[PDB]
From a paper:
Rotaviruses infect cells by delivering into the cytosol a transcriptionally active inner capsid particle (a "double-layer particle": DLP). VP4, activated by proteolytic cleavage into VP8* and VP5*, is the principal membrane-interacting partner; VP7, held together by Ca2+ ions at its trimer interfaces, is a Ca2+-sensitive “clamp” that anchors VP4 onto the underlying DLP. Accompanying or following the engulfment step is a large-scale conformational rearrangement of the projecting VP4 trimer (cleaved to VP8* and VP5*) from an asymmetric, “upright” conformation to a threefold symmetric, “reversed” conformation. A major consequence of the reversal is projection outward of the ~250 amino-acid residue “foot” segment of the VP5* polypeptide chain.
A further classification step then yielded two maps from 56,593 and 70,018 subparticles (classes 5 and 6), respectively, with relatively well-defined lipid-bilayer density (classification #4). Local resolution estimates for classes 5 and 6 showed a well-resolved, virion-bound VP5* β-barrel trimer with its central coiled-coil domain and a poorly resolved lipid bilayer. The class 6 reconstruction has pronounced lipid bilayer density on one side of the reversed VP5* and somewhat fuzzier density on the side opposite. The angle between the curving bilayer and the VP5* trimer axis shows that this class represents a reversed spike near the edge of the contact. The side with a well-defined profile faces the nearest fivefold axis. We verified that many of the subparticles contributing to this class indeed came from reversed VP5* spikes related by a five-fold axes, by mapping the class assignment onto the original micrographs. The coiled-coil at the C-terminal end of the VP5* β-barrel domains extends just to the inner lipid headgroup layer, and diffuse density extends beyond it into the bilayer profile, but peeling away of the bilayer leaves nearly all the engaged spikes at the periphery of the contact, and the resolution leaves uncertain the molecular features of the likely membrane-penetrating elements. The tips of the VP5* β barrel are hydrophobic loops. Two of the three tips contact the liposome bilayer, while its curvature from flattening has probably eliminated a contact from the third. The reconstruction shows that the central coiled-coil domain protrudes into the lipid bilayer, although flattening and distortion of the liposomes have prevented us from resolving protein structure within the bilayer.
Author numbering:
A (entry chain 2): 248 to 494
B (entry chain 1): 248 to 283
C (entry chain i), D (entry chain g): 55 to 326
E (entry chain k): 51 to 315
Write the structure that this text describes.
Amino acid sequence: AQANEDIVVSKTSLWKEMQYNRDITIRFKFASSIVKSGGLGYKWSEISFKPANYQYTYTRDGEEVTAHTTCSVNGMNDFNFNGGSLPTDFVISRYEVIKENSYVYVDYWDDSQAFRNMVYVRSLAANLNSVICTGGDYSFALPVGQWPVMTGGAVSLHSAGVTLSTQFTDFVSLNSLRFRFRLTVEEPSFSITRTRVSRLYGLPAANPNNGKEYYEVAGRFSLISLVPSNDDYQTPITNSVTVRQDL
Amino acid sequence: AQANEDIVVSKTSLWKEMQYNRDITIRFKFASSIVK
Amino acid sequence: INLPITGSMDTAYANSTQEETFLTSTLCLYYPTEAATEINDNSWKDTLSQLFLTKGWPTGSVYFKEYTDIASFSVDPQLYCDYNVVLMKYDATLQLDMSELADLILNEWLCNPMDITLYYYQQTDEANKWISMGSSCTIKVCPLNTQTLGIGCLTTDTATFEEVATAEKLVITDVVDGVNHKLDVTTATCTIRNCKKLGPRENVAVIQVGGSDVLDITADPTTAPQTERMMRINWKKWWQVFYTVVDYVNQIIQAMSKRSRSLNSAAFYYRI
Amino acid sequence: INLPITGSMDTAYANSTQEETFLTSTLCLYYPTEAATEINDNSWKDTLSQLFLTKGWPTGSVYFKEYTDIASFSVDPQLYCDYNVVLMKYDATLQLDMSELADLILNEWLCNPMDITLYYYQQTDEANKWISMGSSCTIKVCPLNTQTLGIGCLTTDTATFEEVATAEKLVITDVVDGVNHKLDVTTATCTIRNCKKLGPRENVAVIQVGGSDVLDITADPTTAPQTERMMRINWKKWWQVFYTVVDYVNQIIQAMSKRSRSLNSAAFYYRI
Amino acid sequence: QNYGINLPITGSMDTAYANSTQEETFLTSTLCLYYPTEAATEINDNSWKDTLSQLFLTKGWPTGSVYFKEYTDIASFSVDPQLYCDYNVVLMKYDATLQLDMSELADLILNEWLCNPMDITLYYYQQTDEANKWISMGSSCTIKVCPLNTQTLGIGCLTTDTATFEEVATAEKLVITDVVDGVNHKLDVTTATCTIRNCKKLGPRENVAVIQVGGSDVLDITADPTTAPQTERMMRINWKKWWQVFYTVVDYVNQIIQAMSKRSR
Ligand SMILES: *[C@@H]1O[C@H](CO)[C@@H](O)[C@H](O)[C@H]1NC(C)=O
Ligand SMILES: *[C@@H]1O[C@H](CO)[C@@H](O)[C@H](O)[C@H]1NC(C)=O
Ligand SMILES: *[C@@H]1O[C@H](CO)[C@@H](O)[C@H](O)[C@H]1NC(C)=O
Ligand SMILES: [Ca+2]
Ligand SMILES: [Ca+2]
Ligand SMILES: [Ca+2]
Ligand SMILES: [Ca+2]
Ligand SMILES: [Ca+2]
Ligand SMILES: [Ca+2]
Ligand SMILES: [Ca+2]
Ligand SMILES: [Ca+2]
Ligand SMILES: [Ca+2]
């Protein structure tokens, strides 16, 4: 059997249950939100995660396949560090870290036949390989004085259950495949330099990518979806959003 | 006839028309936006 | 030929085709480097030819082909003659390798190529196998389920694959027939071919120079046969080996029989 | 049953009982810890079960039983299944041990206990042997003449006795039949039993994973047989061995036959 | 001499009644008592075995035919009973806190089981007929079971959370578990200390004989709560000593071994 098969397990007049068994190259990326409080510049408000889209185009076995991936995090732990109540001490009201109790969600979508009209899916399962996400170096640009740098943090992402999801964006809406990942804390720890904090496991939410373009992980997925028998039907993908007009 | 029934008023090769008659307890809530 | 043959039990036994099959056939020996090393002579080939001349084989009919090692010979062997004899040194650290060599040369294989990237293959019957040749073959396999995912292995994480070979020059692999396997091979250094085992090759004759009979051609564990052209010797030198072969070459070639399938210089037919 | 059976040759060959014996029977492998180690996977049992499932053997019929050493297994082997396979490594220094193991599990024994101190025993026929099990058995025996004296030994001096075992976990002792022997055994760690060899056990199949055929089941030095449920593989890995056993399990079970005597878990019957 | 085959045997009704096999089956067979430590404790003698054998001698059982094999308690004997003799007698004390233990022991020894192995971690089992049960032995067995539905999901239990499982056994040395026939059950067992085996009950074992030394008949061998039988080799006694019990066993050993018949297997 080919690595990119497509089979029919049932076919009525208009509909048909099509099986798909395909290899994929999930290239995703974190994205951090940094909100700095006012005053002098010695107090930071939040250092958190933001769901991050990343669209790429990779090469299949003699085919070019465009994709769209979206990384998110759930159940992260909220730490904080306050060394003084005065406007001249370095303080971080709330920053996020990832540990065992958290999960990493990755929605995936391609331009292939599997995701053309996918709204119904059963017999879902996947074989994913594990990777290692390492944090980078974020230099807190204080107004004057020293420059603490949050540096380090490593954590291994291991395959977990799979589900469906919907990637919403200002351009496209995608009925997508949701891969979950659990976390096992690794040896490289993250520490704020020139500060009384160090040797605490997890990943920092300031520079998770470590100056990388993405995190790559290869996988295979196998499902059975409902596709109209005629291979000409199309489900709306693009969007034109005007939500949060009150905002 | 039950309160939370589930009936099949038709059935084709793949799809099916099902009827659902169920009781519910809508526990809803408002939320206000203040701006100063 | 689909047609039948007929005969009779009253006809007479013809004269000996020996002393003519010799003339109109060629003989080829496959000796290890160790032999010429222990000998330290530069005319032993002409000597053995002059000896064969008494047994009937003319001057330009015998040939000798060195092979540094069993595995270096197992790497794409090429037997292109009319009567091949192989002298094979015994070593318990090479038993399966010099049994796979036997399984390859004594038998006649019909081989198709394999594209691991684009396809996932399976063995149909108990005669289909996967034979892989090259300088260092590391073969791993993940069996698959009805929905093309892994069984005790991850279809992507090659560490979770199941290792059937570790840096081997010639591997003959049989897996559970009826399931699809995803393979990982050192394709840069080794080529793998899906080969079916046809009727045997009666042109060659293996001679285990040392230990007891261990070659199990049949991959099934029940048979463990000993064919007629799988001989054994006990040795302490090599000149005695070669003199014994020359003295009992008639029995060897009576145990061997010319081929019927086709003319081919490799150890396996190719049919794409 | 004592009655006779009758039949014919016109009666027809009934269908294959394979594909129903697989459903109504159990299969049990006995593998070494070396195999689990070389595999280094915690799902290979489920893998092999899912594989067997294609050969017809259902899920809950295949079983795997780890045995750390040939000797540790030889210490009271407990086979309780309908079809037992044993994978046995080859070691010259363990030749007689893995031969006695074969001699014990392949054949069916009827055993009475032995009270060395109170009584003095002898062997009657060429199948009445003395099998001793335990963690470290060191056995010595003194033959006795017609008038209950020693021959080359003294009834009191345990050092004059003739040693036949030296810290062996399983020993099968055959002494001269017709004379009474006084024994000395490390009874604290070992139990010895006077056993009679009955017809063979057709439920078990030994598979020598390594070297040449060495097993001499029969104690007499004239037969040197090789039965049908006694196989030989040549190996460099273990996944190949298991894939082979799976792909050729039907030949194995065709070489084996369910028992006739009775239901028993031990390798030998007890009758006091 | 055909083994493994079952053939019709014929007979008549005018043949004469052959001689007695008693007084010869004794000489060519062995007997084995299984007495508790309490009895030797009460006795406080080191020659009572020789005494009983010299007494047996008068009933025809020679010296090297009778054997005594001691056990400390009912459950310690329940752990892998090895009854390997031509005739087996088992003296058994009565205690309301052990009724099920000494019913399971009876069910196990009086009957001849065909036991296949079990691998909990991989497989999920079911009982097919009313004779298929799961017998677990060991020093401390603690068994929990979850029935499953048609689509391999739980019924009042979660396949992962072992706590949700239903406890049928709690630190028992011998358990004979019968569950509903037709539903695949997932198990959790203290496999470090206990071994569990899927056993089909065949015809009975006529080679053993249980003798309840105290209270009334309680043994519900048959799992089905309808039969509640009482076989011929399920005896009862009233006791205030143990020497009287042993003298009685001796003096009536002939009826005991007439109630016991050597095995078929
Ligand atoms: C076969 O051998 C015999 C005996 O030497 C000889 O007479 C005969 O001529 C031979 N056949 C032919 C065709 O020469
Ligand atoms: C016996 O085998 C033949 C050939 O496969 C088949 O047609 C027939 O139905 C079988 N009968 C039984 C009773 O299995
Ligand atoms: C059977 O019993 C009768 C009466 O005691 C006796 O005469 C006869 O000899 C016995 N049979 C044999 C074979 O001894
Ligand atoms: Ca090899
Ligand atoms: Ca694996
Ligand atoms: Ca095969
Ligand atoms: Ca031994
Ligand atoms: Ca001596
Ligand atoms: Ca003997
Ligand atoms: Ca109990
Ligand atoms: Ca519950
Ligand atoms: Ca039941």
